[PDB]
Each structure stands twice: as C-alpha cells, then as structure tokens.
Design an enzyme around this catalytic site. Sequence first.
Site, PDB file in Angstrom:
ATOM      1  CB  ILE A 181      -0.936   0.040   1.224  1.00 21.61           C
ATOM      2  CG1 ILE A 181      -1.773  -1.233   1.340  1.00 21.61           C
ATOM      3  CG2 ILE A 181      -1.810   1.275   1.151  1.00 21.61           C
ATOM      4  CD1 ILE A 181      -2.392  -1.420   2.722  1.00 21.61           C
ATOM      5  CB  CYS A 182       1.572   3.861  -2.447  1.00 25.28           C
ATOM      6  SG  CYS A 182       2.310   5.495  -2.610  1.00 25.28           S
ATOM      7  CG  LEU A 183      -2.283   5.672   3.215  1.00 21.88           C
ATOM      8  CD1 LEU A 183      -2.977   6.570   2.203  1.00 21.88           C
ATOM      9  CD2 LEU A 183      -3.292   4.717   3.868  1.00 21.88           C
TER      10      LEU A 183
END
Length: 426
Positions: A181-183
């Site tokens: 996840i890119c967060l």
Amino acid sequence: GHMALPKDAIPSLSECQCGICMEILVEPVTLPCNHTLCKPCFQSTVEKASLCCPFCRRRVSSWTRYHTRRNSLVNVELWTIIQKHYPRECKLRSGSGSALKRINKELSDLARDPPAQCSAGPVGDDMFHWQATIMGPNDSPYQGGVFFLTIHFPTDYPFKPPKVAFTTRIYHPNINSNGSICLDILRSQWSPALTISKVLLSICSLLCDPNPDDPLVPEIARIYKTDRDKYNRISREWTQKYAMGSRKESYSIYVYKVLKQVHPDTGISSKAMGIMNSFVNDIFERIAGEASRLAHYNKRSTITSREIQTAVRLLLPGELAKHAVSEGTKAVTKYTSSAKAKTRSSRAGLQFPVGRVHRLLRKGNYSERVGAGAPVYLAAVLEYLTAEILELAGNAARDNKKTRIIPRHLQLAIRNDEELNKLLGR
Ligand SMILES: [Cl-]
Ligand SMILES: [Cl-]
Ligand SMILES: [Cl-]
Ligand SMILES: [Cl-]
Ligand SMILES: [Cl-]
Ligand SMILES: [Cl-]
Ligand SMILES: [Cl-]
Ligand code: NA
Ligand code: NA
Ligand code: NA
Ligand SMILES: [Zn+2]
Ligand SMILES: [Zn+2]
C-alpha cells in the site's frame, strides 16, 4: 480553581491520551517543543535514554536538567484539567513505552470503541502479528467487499510504522498485486501518536479516493484518470471475484462476523459466502414483501415491527418462527431501552446492519413509512437465521475434517435440517 476552560474546549478522553503508551496522560510533561507525554513515558524514553523528544527529536537535555532539579517537569495547567474531567481514568492509571504494552492497549481500545467498518486483532497468540478486516466503503466501487489485511508490528513500535498489506486482491492504483500500500500514514507521515485504527480509517478513505498521481500500478492510475467508468467497473468486478462482493446487496462482512461468533476457528469460501448472501437477500425480500402486504391489507401507511413479526410467523416453520420472533423482540426491547450509540446495530446488540436494513426497506417502496423498530426486528431475524445455518454448516465441515465451510457443507446442513430445508428449499 487553578483554571478553567470554555466548555467548548474541554478535551475529550481520546485527546488526553499519551501518544507513546496510549494510556491517559498522568502528570503530563510538555517539552519546550510543546509535545506532551506522560511522566512514566518521559522517564522511560527521554530522561533514561536519548534526552530527545520522541515526536520531533529535539534535544531537551538542558531543559530536563533545569526542571528535574526544580521538580517543574509537569505541565500543571494541563494536569489539573485532565484530573478534573477524567478523575476515574487517572486513578485507575521503564514499564511505559514498551511496544508489547502499547499494542495491547490499542487492542483493548479497539474492543471498547471499534473503528467504523473495520476490525483487527492477533492471528494466533503473537501480539506483533495481526490480521485486519476492512469492508469496502459504500462511496466506492468496493462496496460490499470484505478485504483482509496483515499487520506486522516492529519491535520498536510505536516509534517505527506498522507494516500493513492487503491479502485480498484489489484493483487499486495505490495497491499492487502483492498487497503493498502506497499511503503517507504508513511511511512519510507516520507518528508514534497514530494508531492501527487511524491507519485502517486512512486505508478506507484511500479506497474511496485514490491518489492517481503517486501510483503503485500506473496502468490502473491511467484508467482512473481517463476512463473512470471502466475503473469503477473493473473495481466492482474484482470485489465480486476476490472480496466476496455481490451483484445484489452484500452481507458478507456480517456473515463473517456471525461466523466468528459461532465458529471462530472456521473459515468460509467465497462460493459458500455467495450462497449465504442469496439466503439473506431472499429472506429479506420475502419478509419485506409480506410485511408490505400486511400493512396495505390493513389500511396502514407504515411498516412497523408488528408487521415484521406477523410476516415472520407466516413465512417460517414453527420452531424457527418462535425463535426468530424471540430474537427479533429481544432486539427491539434492548434497542428502545438503550441509549443512542455509535451504530444503531450496536444499540440493538446486533451484528447485522440496522441502518442499512432501514434504508433498504424505504428504498424498496414497500410502504410510505417504515418505523424504527422494523429494521431492528428484521436485522435480528436475518442474524438469527445466519447463525443457525452457519452453526450447522460449521459442524458439518468439522465432521468432514475440514477447517473451511464450502458449498457442500451448506447444502448438507440445510437438507438434513427439516425446517431449514422447508425455508430455503427453492
Ligand atoms: Cl475546565
Ligand atoms: Cl531551559
Ligand atoms: Cl474518568
Ligand atoms: Cl468519579
Ligand atoms: Cl447506524
Ligand atoms: Cl450498547
Ligand atoms: Cl416500528
Ligand atoms: Na508491503
Ligand atoms: Na409459519
Ligand atoms: Na431509532
Ligand atoms: Zn505514556
Ligand atoms: Zn517535540
């Protein structure tokens, strides 16, 4: 009085928690950078170790020396405010700052106040390894899906971020085929004061509103930017294929929660879940339709819990009807005698969604008005029937030396039970 705040500005209990140990601040120490931590945490993580602020790494060795000598470390104004407004929590309160204790406190906090539409906990007696369950938001093409995630806590939690990845396949520009996840909250914006709850809520917000300009999957981001309708379509198709979504109304998260009540160490396959979903939608349609006709025949504009009760007796075989009626009545009385809560379901003591069932009853044009008790009653009946079906199917999977419920186990348990066969024969 030492001081007082405007009523508007009295801090909540959550706003009085220590960002390091997640316990209520006691003898809060506010550093010259205006970051605060409880005195036990100040002793364990600042005075006895780095002499730096845990939140912004500013050195405070001179400050500490000065105020340790004068016993003026504590922010007395904040301390008075917290004692006045949360005296019980203060009284109940290098031990502090330990990762294992912080993770346990976060788990308890989830039990008392679970986040909206999420859930998480240890997979098997290792506190640093959790599984999480997220449900697709309604304002998103992931509506109705049950997305499972893994959470690995580092040994220096909360000072380093948790490692969170989807285990359920999802079509998202910021989530790749491995589940990474890119967060921002997981890396660049991580802070010790953030919690697994806020991370799960930040993920749900990401499912609602992706960030196509910083993607893990450029092809999906390009589609999201150019052909949003195709993105939504594929998103929905993947939710149905891999996240137990449904073409019709989805109850998968609630079926799973009920399953965890009656058989915690037992799973369910996506195909068996699709069958459960058909059952719930059928029972709903039948009960709601009969209740529509009962109100109309009797010249009543409103469907209440009384028409739901009569519909249940007309539609279910004897013993199932009596138990369903008992559960539906128990839920309505518990509801009316309970305070408004975070969810209507929680006020009713139910897993199934009272608010959603109410909306569906009004959207279906079954009647001009729908009383507040009808959805409580109906939701409790669907939960009871779900619980009875799953208990039998789980018993059947155990007798077949299986740890997961499959369509065969569902078909077995319904054919062998006379009343369930009559109700769900089709
Ligand atoms: Cl005050
Ligand atoms: Cl100083
Ligand atoms: Cl209190
Ligand atoms: Cl008290
Ligand atoms: Cl609600
Ligand atoms: Cl409650
Ligand atoms: Cl009602
Ligand atoms: Na990852
Ligand atoms: Na009946
Ligand atoms: Na109500
Ligand atoms: Zn603390
Ligand atoms: Zn600081």
